[PDB]
Structure formats: C-alpha cells, structure tokens
Amino acid sequence: MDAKARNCLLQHREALEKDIKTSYIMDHMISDGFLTISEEEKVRNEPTQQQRAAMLIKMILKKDNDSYVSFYNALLHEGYKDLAALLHDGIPVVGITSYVRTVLCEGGVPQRPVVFVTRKKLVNAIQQKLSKLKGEPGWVTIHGMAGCGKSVLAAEAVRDHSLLEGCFPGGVHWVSVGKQDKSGLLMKLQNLCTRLDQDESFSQRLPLNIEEAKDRLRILMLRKHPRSLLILDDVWDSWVLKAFDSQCQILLTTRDKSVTDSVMGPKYVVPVESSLGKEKGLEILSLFVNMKKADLPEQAHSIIKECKGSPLVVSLIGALLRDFPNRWEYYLKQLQNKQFKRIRKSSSYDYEALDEAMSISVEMLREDIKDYYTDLSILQKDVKVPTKVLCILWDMETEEVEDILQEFVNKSLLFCDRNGKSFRYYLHDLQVDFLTEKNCSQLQDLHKKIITQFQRYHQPHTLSPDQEDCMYWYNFLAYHMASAKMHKELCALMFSLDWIKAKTELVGPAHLIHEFVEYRHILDEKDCAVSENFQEFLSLNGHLLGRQPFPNIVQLGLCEPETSEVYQQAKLQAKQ
C-alpha cells in the first residue's frame, strides 16, 4: 500500500485494536474479496477481542490499497465513525458512498439482511414519494403485511447518496416502534430524545411523559435536526403517530394504512405486495447457496411455492440449504409435511410456513447451542437487547456470547444492529410468536433464570447509567420477575423507597406507576394492598418525581397515611 496509508494505519493501530469487534468487519471484507476464509479463521482463534483486532490489522498491513479502503468501508458500515476518521487521513486511491454509510449508521438504520435482493420498483416508488416532501413536513407510509419486507425497504430507500444529500442533508434517524402502550411509547421516545441530543445542548433530564417528549422532539428536530428524515418502523396506532406530529418529515411502516387518520399534512402511500415473487424468492435461495438461479435444483421452485412469498421464510430455508447442501428433497418434504402445532391458531398472519421453517431450522442447530436459542424465548417484541444482558443470562464472556449469537444471526434466526462496538440483538415479531408458542411451558423458568443470573452480577441499588445494560434492567427487571411469577422478589424490588428514588430520578414515575398496576395480579391479598399504597404515593407525587431539584422521598413518604407501608419505610429511614 501507499506510505501515507501504512503510516496512517500504523499510527492508529492501538486505537483500532482497543475498540473494534472483528466479526462483522471481516464479513464485509470477505464480501469485497480482500480477505480470505482461513485469514478469518486465524483471527477468530485469537483468545480475545483485542487480539482478534491485532491479528486482523497485522494481516491488513501486508495488503494492497483496496483492502485499506474495504476495511475503511467496513468501519463506516459497522459504525466506527471516529476510527475511520483517523484512517481517512491516509486513504489511498482504489449509489452507496462513505457519506451514505456514515449517515445511516449515525441514524441507527439497520444494516442490510445477511442475504439481500433488490426490489427496485418498490424502492424507487418510496424514493419518489420522499422526494415530494421538498423540505416541508409530511408523511410517507409503507404499508403491507407482517414480514413482507417493509423495514428492509425503508432502509434501502435512504441508502442512496443523491436522495440523502438532496432531500435530507440533516440526516435520518430510525425509530423501532412496534405495538406500544403509553409507557412503552414513552420508553421509546426517551431513548430517541437521548439519541437526538448527544452533545447535550438541550436538557440533561429525560422527558417524563408523552406530552413533554412530543414537545422535546419538536425542539430537537427544529434546532438540531432540521431538513432530516425520521423513520418509524411498525406503527400500530394513530395515537402513536400524533406523538410524532411536530412539523417533521416522516417515513413510517405499518400493517394498517389507517394509522395516519389523526394526523394532517401531505400524505403519500406505498403499498407493498403481500408476497415476494417467485423469481426474487429463487434469487434469495441462489445467493444463500452460492449458485446461479438457472443452476438451482428442481426442488427450489417447489420450496418457493411452500414459502408462500414470505422473505423471512425463504431466508430461513435458504440458510438451511446453505448449511446442509445436498438435502433439497429432504427439506422440501419437511415443508410439505407440516408437523408443528399452533395453539394460538389464527392471527393477522398465516404462520404455517414460518412455523415450520423455524421448527426445522431450530431442529438443525448443533446440540450445544439449542438451549441457548431456547433461552431467547424471553426476548420481547420490539426490544433490542445489548450483549451484556446475554452475558449475564449465560454467565459467559462477551466474545463467546457474540460468537454464539452470530451463528443464529447467520441462520436468520436472530438479528443484530451494530453501531461500532455496541451490539444489540432482536427477533422479528413473527419469531417471538414462534418461540412463545414452541416453548410456552418453559417460559416461566426462563424468566426466573434471568432474574437468578441478574442477582449474581448486580443489585438493584448497584445499577448506573454508564453501564450498557442499565436501562434494560430499569425497564424490564420487574417485567421478568412478574413473568417468572417471583412475587417475593418483585415485592422486595418495588416496595422500596430506594428503588423509587433511583428509578424516578432517571425516567420519572410513569412506567413505575404502570408496573404497579400491570403486575398486581400475581400478588397475594396482603402484597396487593401494599402495592396500592405505593401506587397512590407515586400518583399523588407524580408531578414532583424525576424533576430537578429532586424531591426528598423520605419527607414525601412521611406525608403518607401512618397505615401505609410507604410511611413506615419513610419513618425508618428518617430515624436511621
């Protein structure tokens, strides 16, 4: 390579080694043809994250100008903005540019699926509607059935330099919404407000209710993110859309086109066909198995027919065929002879083919990871979970956890959004439904497992927002205990001035109040009454909690009726 390049590479090596995770970086470099499979295997055998990184950078140092740029592009693709900035210095000569790769990563837009086929006519129709917004507020709605590929479409539509530069110089921000209640949407809006004001030029505290969050979003889009697009993935209710109605440009996906009825301004719509066509389905298969479409066996056309146009199902089956290469007849027959049993029968969706594909794929998991996949049945819809949460669940180190999860990801059984060093894992809604149904009888014990494992790494009072899993536990500790039916632990957590103080000072009272209401049904008569004590203490004082300067929770508790357990706890602390 160039002298600029090497000096620059050699110069930033320790910075690179320190921070980069190599797995998805190498996936890109392999695809670009600048890194071999044995080179990957040699890197993956290094015992640690940094030694994997050291090994790779050593290999790249003995490599041409194009590898540097490929590696540069993997860094942007994977969210290593600041490390790539240091490599920009030494960049040699060699619709998706570096600009697109950085803008989308910055906005948290999902990377392309493991295997990806173009859908040009749909992508162009979305881009055409987005180009009609002309720097003014408006709504573009992508609508169609669950799993038809809307979110992949929305991400591809913005994966374009001219559109981005010409229409949205302020960038794009992706919000994963899904089906939400008020406190669920609030959690999403709080996280969004944090993302949109990183340099902290506006309030350090979170919005504490939907009205405040709507207002803060309005200010951040006006003052920080003018001429930008907000992308809302999977909106179920028109009331949710009103929370975002703040003079913005919005692209959203939905199963229900009527979600835009409570909202005003320019409205454009792109219907997505319920089924991927035969040829595109075959193309997905061919890319998974690495052959030309015309060289596919005869079973391929039958398999596509059995997949009923669902790209998730086609992908599950394609990954199986890649993994077990001469079994086309065997897997066609399993798909035709459907053995899986849906209890929660009907839906807004035909599960038949997805259930069977999931069932076959899960069955073929090598035996020492089958139980790990079962554990993921406790993952919720529309929650992207940080690696650390699974380290805790499995008592394993980060490298080992991430390796196991990549095996699921590579089989389309799991998804991973990468922003540089931060890794977050999620399931498609339809996969949550499958696991919940498959493992229904284990679900309580799995929820109990996470609480048991959490209690060896943390204490509730030990939780701090610098750590990557912090908000997961504030948001979902009570949820998991209640799902585990662990009434004792739930009471010990929630019937606590300390917990109220800690949680309200971060996120305010609203979710807490909802958790008291939602989980009260698992409690005996005695604890149910104390639940109500705490709930009314929070509702009474709800305007005060989480607002700086923070109220004295002991003083507030001493204003509760003397029969109240809140008062009795407040009395003890006052003395102590």
Report the nearest approach of ligand ADP to the CB of residue 131 (Å). 21
Segment 262-281, which members bind ligand ADP (CB under 6 A)? Answer: none
Of 28, 77, 150, 447, the one binding ligand ADP (CB under 6 A) is 150
Per the rule left: phi > 0, alpha: psi between -120 and 50, beta: everything else, 141 is beta
Using CA atoms, how far apart are residues 526 and 391, in angstroms rounded to an integer?
36
| 107 annotated among ligand-binding-site residues | no
- Helix or strand run (H / E) with residue 571: helix 565-575
Report the nearest approach of ligand ADP to the CB of residue 373 (Å). 16
∠ CA(492), CA(495), CA(498), 5° rounding?
90
Three-state DSSP at 138 gives strand
Per rule CB under 6 A, is residue 176 in the interface with ligand ADP? no
Segment 81-140, which members bind ligand ADP (CB under 6 A)? Answer: 113, 115-117, 119
Q: Locate 368 and state its tokens.
A: 């020492």
Q: Which stretch binds ligand ADP (CB under 6 A): 90-98, 148-156, 164-172, 174-182?
A: 148-156
Of 281, 311, 460, 508, the one binding ligand ADP (CB under 6 A) is 311
Q: Which stretch binds ligand ADP (CB under 6 A): 10-18, 144-152, 241-249, 395-403?
A: 144-152
Report the nearest approach of ligand ADP to the CB of residue 283 (Å). 8
Of 111, 249, 359, 412, the one binding ligand ADP (CB under 6 A) is 412
Per rule CB under 6 A, is residue 431 in the interface with ligand ADP? no
Three-state DSSP at 433 gives helix
Of 49, 151, 254, 531, the one binding ligand ADP (CB under 6 A) is 151
- Contact between 306 and 335 under an 8 Å Cβ cutoff? The reply is yes
| 151 annotated among ligand-binding-site residues | yes
Of 133, 146, 187, 486, the one binding ligand ADP (CB under 6 A) is 146
Report the nearest approach of ligand ADP to the CB of residue 361 (Å). 12
CA dist 344 → 220, 436, 437, 574 (Å): 43, 10, 8, 52
Per rule CB under 6 A, is residue 546 in the interface with ligand ADP? no
**Residues in Cβ contact with 69 at an 8 Å cutoff, skipping those fewer than 6 apart:** 91, 92, 94
Convert 8-35 to b/e letters by CB count within 10 Å (16 or more is b).
bbeebbeebbeebbbbbbbbbbbeeebb
Report the nearest approach of ligand ADP to the CB of residue 380 (Å). 16
Per rule CB under 6 A, is residue 178 in the interface with ligand ADP? no
Of 147, 184, 207, 309, the one binding ligand ADP (CB under 6 A) is 147
Q: Locate 502 and state its tokens.
A: 């800690």
Nearest Cα to Cα of residue 214 among 189, 183, 237: 189
Per rule CB under 6 A, is residue 428 in the interface with ligand ADP? yes
For tokens 């990468």, the residue is: 418
For ligand ADP, give the closer residue by CB, 57 or 115.
Answer: 115
CA dist 90 → 4, 28, 65, 85 (Å): 5, 20, 10, 10
Q: Locate 221 and state its tokens.
A: 């889009």
Per rule CB under 6 A, is residue 148 in the interface with ligand ADP? yes
Using CA atoms, how far apart are residues 557 and 547, in angstroms rounded to an integer?
17
Of 259, 312, 332, 553, the one binding ligand ADP (CB under 6 A) is 312
Using CA atoms, how far apart are residues 108 and 111, in angstroms rounded to an integer?
9
Of 53, 152, 335, 490, the one binding ligand ADP (CB under 6 A) is 152
| 146 annotated among ligand-binding-site residues | yes
Report the nearest approach of ligand ADP to the CB of residue 450 (Å). 25
Angle between helices 328-336 and 299-307 (to 10 degrees): 30
| 147 annotated among ligand-binding-site residues | yes
For ligand ADP, give the closer residue by CB, 428 or 438.
Answer: 428
In 62-181, where does DSSP find H-type helix? 65-78, 81-88, 98-106, 120-130, 150-158, 161-167
Report the nearest approach of ligand ADP to the CB of residue 113 (Å). 4
SS3 of 337-378: CCCCCCCCCCCCCCCHHHHHHHHHHHHCCCCCCHHHHHHHHH
Cis-peptide, bond into residue 549, ω within 30° of zero: yes
Per rule CB under 6 A, is residue 307 in the interface with ligand ADP? no
Residue nearest to ligand ADP (CB): 149
Report the nearest approach of ligand ADP to the CB of residue 149 (Å). 3
Report the nearest approach of ligand ADP to the CB of residue 110 (Å). 8
| 291 annotated among ligand-binding-site residues | no
| 148 annotated among ligand-binding-site residues | yes
Using CA atoms, how far apart are residues 63 and 73, in angstroms rounded to an integer?
15
For ligand ADP, give the closer residue by CB, 282 or 553.
Answer: 282
CA dist 204 → 70, 216, 461, 541 (Å): 38, 12, 22, 22
Q: Which stretch binds ligand ADP (CB under 6 A): 147-155, 184-192, 213-221, 389-397?
A: 147-155
Report the nearest approach of ligand ADP to the CB of residue 447 (Å). 26
Per rule CB under 6 A, is residue 284 in the interface with ligand ADP? yes
Query: For ligand ADP, how many residues bind (rule: CB under 6 A)?
Result: 19
For ligand ADP, give the closer residue by CB, 147 or 546.
Answer: 147
∠ CA(211), CA(214), CA(216), 5° rounding?
110
| 149 annotated among ligand-binding-site residues | yes
For ligand ADP, give the closer residue by CB, 29 or 146.
Answer: 146
Annotated binding site: 144-151, 255
Annotated binding site for ATP: 144-151, 255
Q: Which residues bind ligand ADP (CB under 6 A)?
A: 113, 115-117, 119, 146-152, 253, 284, 311-312, 315, 412, 428
